[PDB]
Structure 1
Amino acid sequence: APTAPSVDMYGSNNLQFSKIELAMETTSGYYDMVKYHDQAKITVKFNQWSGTPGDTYNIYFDGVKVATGAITGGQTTATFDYGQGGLYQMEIEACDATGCSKSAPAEITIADTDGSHLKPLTMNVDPNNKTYNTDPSVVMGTYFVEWGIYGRNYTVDNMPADNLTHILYGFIPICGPNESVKSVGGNSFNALQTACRGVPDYEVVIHDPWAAYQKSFPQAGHEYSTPIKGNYAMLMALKQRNPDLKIIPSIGGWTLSDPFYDFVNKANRDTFVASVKKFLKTWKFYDGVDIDWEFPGGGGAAADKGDPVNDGPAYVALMRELRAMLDELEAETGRTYELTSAIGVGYDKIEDVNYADAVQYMDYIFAMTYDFYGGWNNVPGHQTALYCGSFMRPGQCDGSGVDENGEAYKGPAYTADNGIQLLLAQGVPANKLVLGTAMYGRGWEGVTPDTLTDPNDPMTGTATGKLKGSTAQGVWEDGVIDYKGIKSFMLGANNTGINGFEYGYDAQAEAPWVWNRTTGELITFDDHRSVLAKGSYAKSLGLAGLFSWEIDADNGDILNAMHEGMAGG
């Protein structure tokens, strides 16, 4: 036998390799930062000094031959392609006529974006999140937001994964027209422009690569040499821990929807869809695509856009082409891919798409059954109600009446059930709809008792302006408030009212509120009871399940209520 081969660790990159090179110390165009390879370029050096090195080498991973070549002297550098991620016990075998000598096994790491090379994530979940007899056939979705790792300080390991089947990662931008991104203020529009340099219009990109894959997370064991970090490496590890959990990219949303309005041009769709396939090939932990176009026909962040005539068909065509692309990805990988979309449920949003035509391609519609009322104006109302509250005027629920300035109503009122029914009437199968629960409140200030026309119902009053508060109370933007912030700063431990706030519940609409008679502060939100009503309603209608916006704002209560209201028959 030859001399035993000896592995030069330094000359073998310390046996660490990766299918994806990721810029770690700069912010640039998407393709200056992200380079993917189907075959990792593996390089192993070994030494057989002042001895008999033999004629040929073989390299095994877990006893399986992956590489072979000739030996010439005491220094052999072996290169070769490997296309599957993982950890492997690697062995070097030198052979010649008289037999074969081996190195001692050493662990080689081939990183890939499926997490195949990672140990299951170490969770750090608030224990208020209870343990449940999960039913894997019911949808329990939620949104996790890329920027929530900053001030909100809520990271992938805080997610109650065991109580989720569906994680929607918000949000993936589309390069092109994005004037809406500017009202978000800050660095946001500039971050987009940087990521889209060298990127053709209507291609998807990562908006914040620092959060996505750059930030070193200690609890995830990240270090300087670590080839993938940030949120994505954590989601990858999370798939190893929870393999059946669907993690799906969410494209668009409120401020990143502007480019969807050009998808009336099929060539822009062709470029988009293709970029979505490369995205999913590049980022293998994702399980499909969710389209959050707000909204065909208009009505979203851009007062500027919206085509009620042509947007609907563009969206149907997009779902077909996205479905057909995912079909051929399923053929290439053997995986199953899901296609979903979050939609408005006001009647004026719903009528702009023939969801019967598009649903044939989709797995789930996430019905955004919330933001019915809020601080953009001074009309109190249930923002996330199952049914129409008593504060609504006659013929206002169904849109048959006229408003309090004698003007007529143009469609049914903003409730979840008005929304669902309109979708069922359209032909959408009930077992593809997912009902939305809020994990935040919307609220006003200055709804003093004396603004009320019905003294039992502050939803009957008038506001002076948006709710105000601090970051620490969960108020990240005026007139909006995390549920956990409502819990600990307005509800209290017994849910009976603290710091001047009362509790109330509109049993007819299935909608809670908290109300401060003195400040006139009014908050509408989803609570334990109201989510229970949504569970019952979902079951009664054969709805696929429930989903929530946004997980960082929950404290446990809402997701708990979601499981409990879904339990049983």
Structure 2
Amino acid sequence: APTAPSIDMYGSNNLQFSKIELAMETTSGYNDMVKYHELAKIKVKFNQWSGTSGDTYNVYFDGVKVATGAITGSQTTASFEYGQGGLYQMEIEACDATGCSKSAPVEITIADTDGSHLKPLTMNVDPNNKSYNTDPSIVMGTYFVEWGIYGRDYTVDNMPVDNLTHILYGFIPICGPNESVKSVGGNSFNALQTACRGVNDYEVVIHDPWAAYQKSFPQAGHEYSTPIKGNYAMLMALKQRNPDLKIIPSIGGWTLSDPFYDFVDKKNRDTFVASVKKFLKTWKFYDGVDIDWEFPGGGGAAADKGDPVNDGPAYIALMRELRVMLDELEAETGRTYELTSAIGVGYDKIEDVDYADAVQYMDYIFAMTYDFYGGWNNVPGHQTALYCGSFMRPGQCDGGGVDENGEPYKGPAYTADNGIQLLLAQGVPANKLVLGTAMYGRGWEGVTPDTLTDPNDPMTGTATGKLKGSTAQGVWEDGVIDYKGIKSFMLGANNTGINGFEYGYDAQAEAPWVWNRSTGELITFDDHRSVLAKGNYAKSLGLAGLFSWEIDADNGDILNAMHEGMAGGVVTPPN
């Protein structure tokens, strides 16, 4: 027989192969950092210094022949292509007429962006997240933010994945006009400019490649030379742990919606949709796309953008065209892809899209039932309430009344039910609607007792400015505080108030607040009670389920209540 091949491990990249090439120690344009191959190029060097070398080699993976070629003297390079990621026991055999001899087996890794080479992620979840047996039909969604791995120190292995059906990954930008990003300050706009160098306008990119795929996370077993790292490698490993989980990239959001206003021109939609198809071929752990245009018709971060006539038809066409594209991927891969969107629920947002048309293309609508009131002005109110609060004036709820100055309300008040009923009334199916819950509060200072028109209700007072605090308190920007910060700094473990705060609840609205009457600090948020109320509202209307913004800000209480309030329920999945 020929002499047995001896594999040159260091001449063969230590048998580490990847279908994706990712730049690691630089930051450049997306097309120069990320290169995907449908087939991995495998090259394995071996030698046969003694004896006879033979004529032909065969490569085996787990005892199955995967490649063959010619032997070239005493040193040979086996070169072949292979599509399926994984870890395999490789042998190389040399053959002639006399017989065959084979190497010892050695593990080869073929990395792919489905995580097929990875073991299930090891989790590190706060034990306050409890276990439930919610029916698998109901949506239990959350948004994980790319930048949460910095000061917020919240990583993929912290997510209570057994309590989630859908993870929406916030946020993938679109190259093009993005002045709104400058409102974040810091490096955000300039990082986008770098990502978009060499990229056509209206194509998607990764905003922060360090967070997405370069940073080594030791809890994930990464080392510097691992070929895929960051959040994305952790999501791939999470998908091996929980294969029925859906992970969906979120395009847009408040600061990254400016390019959508150019989708009135179909050419720009075509460019965008093609780029999304490429993205989903590159990053196989993703299961669809979520479009978070804030908002058709305007009213978002860009005060100079919005077209009430033309943006709705553009939105619908986008959905049409995305669903054509996703059907191409389902034909090509055999998988199921979802198309979703998060939408505004003020009457003035909903009136600018004919959702009876759009929703036929969509799996789910994540209704943004939060941010109804907040620190952008000095008017208290319930930011995430189901129904109209006591503080509202006569005819404010339904919009038929007049304000304190005698000026007509322009439409129904900002509540979750007013928006859900406008969507239902034009024919959006309940079982495609997902109701939002807030894992944060918004708040004010200066709401002292002398400003209240009803002494029992701080929502009738007036503010002097935003809530101020530190990042240790969960105050990452003025006027906004993580729920886990409200629980540590204002509620306490027994939920009866600490630090000078008192707890109250508007039973009509289904909305909690905490108020420090000495500082006039007032915070509107979702709590156990209001989230139970949202779950029972969702059961009563036959909504698809609940989702939450944003998962790093919870301590377990909000997601627990989401499942609590859904107990016993099932829903028809969209088909």
- TM-score exceeds 0.5: yes
- Correspondence for 1:128: 128
Contact 2:129/2:560 (<8 A) preserved: yes
Measured against aligned partners, the alpha-carbon deviations of 1:513-544 in whole angstroms (never above 9, x if no partner) come to 00001111100000000000000000000000
Measured against aligned partners, the alpha-carbon deviations of 1:188-245 in whole angstroms (never above 9, x if no partner) come to 1100000001000000000000100010110011112100000000000000001000
Cα distance in 1 for partners of 2:25, 2:134 equals: 42
Contact 1:250/1:289 (<8 A) preserved: yes
Report how far residue 132 of structure 1 moved.
Answer: 1.2
Report how far residue 405 of structure 1 moved.
Answer: 1.2
Report how far residue 551 of structure 1 moved.
Answer: 0.2
Report how far residue 66 of structure 1 moved.
Answer: 1.2
Report how far residue 83 of structure 1 moved.
Answer: 1.2
For the residue of structure 2 that corresponds to 1:250, the secondary structure is strand
Report how far residue 406 of structure 1 moved.
Answer: 1.2
Question: Where has structure 1 moved over 4 Å in runs of 4 or more?
Answer: none
Which piece of structure 1 moves more, 65-74 or 468-477? 65-74
Contact 2:438/2:548 (<8 A) preserved: yes
Contact 1:172/1:206 (<8 A) preserved: yes
Contact 1:60/1:91 (<8 A) preserved: yes
For the residue of structure 1 that corresponds to 2:361, the secondary structure is coil
Measured against aligned partners, the alpha-carbon deviations of 1:33-55 in whole angstroms (never above 9, x if no partner) come to 00111111100111111211111
Measured against aligned partners, the alpha-carbon deviations of 1:486-536 in whole angstroms (never above 9, x if no partner) come to 001000010000000000000000000000011111000000000000000
Cα distance in 2 for partners of 1:323, 1:72 equals: 51
Cα distance in 1 for partners of 2:149, 2:13 equals: 32
Measured against aligned partners, the alpha-carbon deviations of 1:412-456 in whole angstroms (never above 9, x if no partner) come to 000000000000011100000000000000000011111111111
TM-score, structure 2 as length reference: 0.98
Report how far residue 59 of structure 1 moved.
Answer: 0.3
Measured against aligned partners, the alpha-carbon deviations of 1:11-48 in whole angstroms (never above 9, x if no partner) come to 11100000001000000000110011111110011111
Contact 1:86/1:117 (<8 A) preserved: yes
Measured against aligned partners, the alpha-carbon deviations of 1:34-85 in whole angstroms (never above 9, x if no partner) come to 0111111100111111211111100011112111011131111111111111
Gaps of 5+ in 2: 570-575
Q: Kindly report which structure 2 residues correspond to 1:145-164, keeping only aligned pairs within 5 A, or say none.
A: 145-164=145-164
Contact 2:3/2:50 (<8 A) preserved: no
Report how far residue 134 of structure 1 moved.
Answer: 3.5
Report how far residue 136 of structure 1 moved.
Answer: 1.5
Cα distance in 2 for partners of 1:385, 1:323 equals: 33
Cα distance in 1 for partners of 2:64, 2:378 equals: 69
For the residue of structure 1 that corresponds to 2:184, the secondary structure is coil
Q: Percent of pairs identical after alignment?
A: 96
Cα distance in 1 for partners of 2:334, 2:493 equals: 49
Which piece of structure 1 moves more, 88-97 or 329-338? 88-97
For the residue of structure 1 that corresponds to 2:67, the secondary structure is strand
For the residue of structure 1 that corresponds to 2:42, the secondary structure is strand
- Correspondence for 2:522: 522
- Correspondence for 1:109: 109
Contact 1:173/1:206 (<8 A) preserved: yes
- Correspondence for 1:99: 99
TM-score, structure 1 as length reference: 0.99
Cα distance in 2 for partners of 1:224, 1:14 equals: 15
- Correspondence for 2:351: 351
Contact 1:93/1:102 (<8 A) preserved: yes
- Correspondence for 2:53: 53
Measured against aligned partners, the alpha-carbon deviations of 1:319-340 in whole angstroms (never above 9, x if no partner) come to 0000000001000000000000
Contact 1:170/1:250 (<8 A) preserved: yes
Measured against aligned partners, the alpha-carbon deviations of 1:456-497 in whole angstroms (never above 9, x if no partner) come to 110011111111111000000001000000001000010000
Which piece of structure 1 moves more, 91-100 or 293-302? 91-100
Cα distance in 1 for partners of 2:136, 2:273 equals: 30
Contact 1:435/1:546 (<8 A) preserved: yes
For the residue of structure 1 that corresponds to 2:108, the secondary structure is strand
Which piece of structure 1 moves more, 132-141 or 156-165? 132-141
Q: Kindly report which structure 2 residues correspond to 1:365-444, keeping only aligned pairs within 5 A, or say none.
A: 365-444=365-444
Cα distance in 2 for partners of 1:426, 1:154 equals: 40
Q: Kindly report which structure 2 residues correspond to 1:71-470, keeping only aligned pairs within 5 A, or say none.
A: 71-470=71-470
Contact 2:59/2:68 (<8 A) preserved: yes
Cα distance in 2 for partners of 1:71, 1:198 equals: 43
Contact 1:159/1:551 (<8 A) preserved: yes
Contact 2:384/2:525 (<8 A) preserved: yes
Query: RMSD of aligned C-alpha atoms?
Result: 0.6
For the residue of structure 2 that corresponds to 1:392, the secondary structure is coil
Cα distance in 1 for partners of 2:225, 2:126 equals: 31
Aligned residues: 569
Cα distance in 2 for partners of 1:200, 1:241 equals: 36
Report how far residue 99 of structure 1 moved.
Answer: 1.3
Which piece of structure 1 moves more, 76-85 or 483-492? 76-85
Report how far residue 131 of structure 1 moved.
Answer: 1.2
Cα distance in 2 for partners of 1:157, 1:72 equals: 48
Contact 2:6/2:47 (<8 A) preserved: yes
Report how far residue 166 of structure 1 moved.
Answer: 0.3
Report how far residue 289 of structure 1 moved.
Answer: 0.1
Contact 1:51/1:74 (<8 A) preserved: no
Contact 2:511/2:530 (<8 A) preserved: yes
Cα distance in 2 for partners of 1:493, 1:200 equals: 52
Contact 2:364/2:432 (<8 A) preserved: yes
Cα distance in 2 for partners of 1:326, 1:121 equals: 28
Cα distance in 1 for partners of 2:400, 2:315 equals: 30
Cα distance in 2 for partners of 1:472, 1:63 equals: 55
Contact 2:135/2:568 (<8 A) preserved: no
Cα distance in 1 for partners of 2:72, 2:222 equals: 39
Measured against aligned partners, the alpha-carbon deviations of 1:87-134 in whole angstroms (never above 9, x if no partner) come to 111111111111111111111000000000001001000000011113
For the residue of structure 1 that corresponds to 2:127, the secondary structure is coil
Measured against aligned partners, the alpha-carbon deviations of 1:264-296 in whole angstroms (never above 9, x if no partner) come to 000000000000000000000000000000000
Cα distance in 2 for partners of 1:469, 1:287 equals: 38
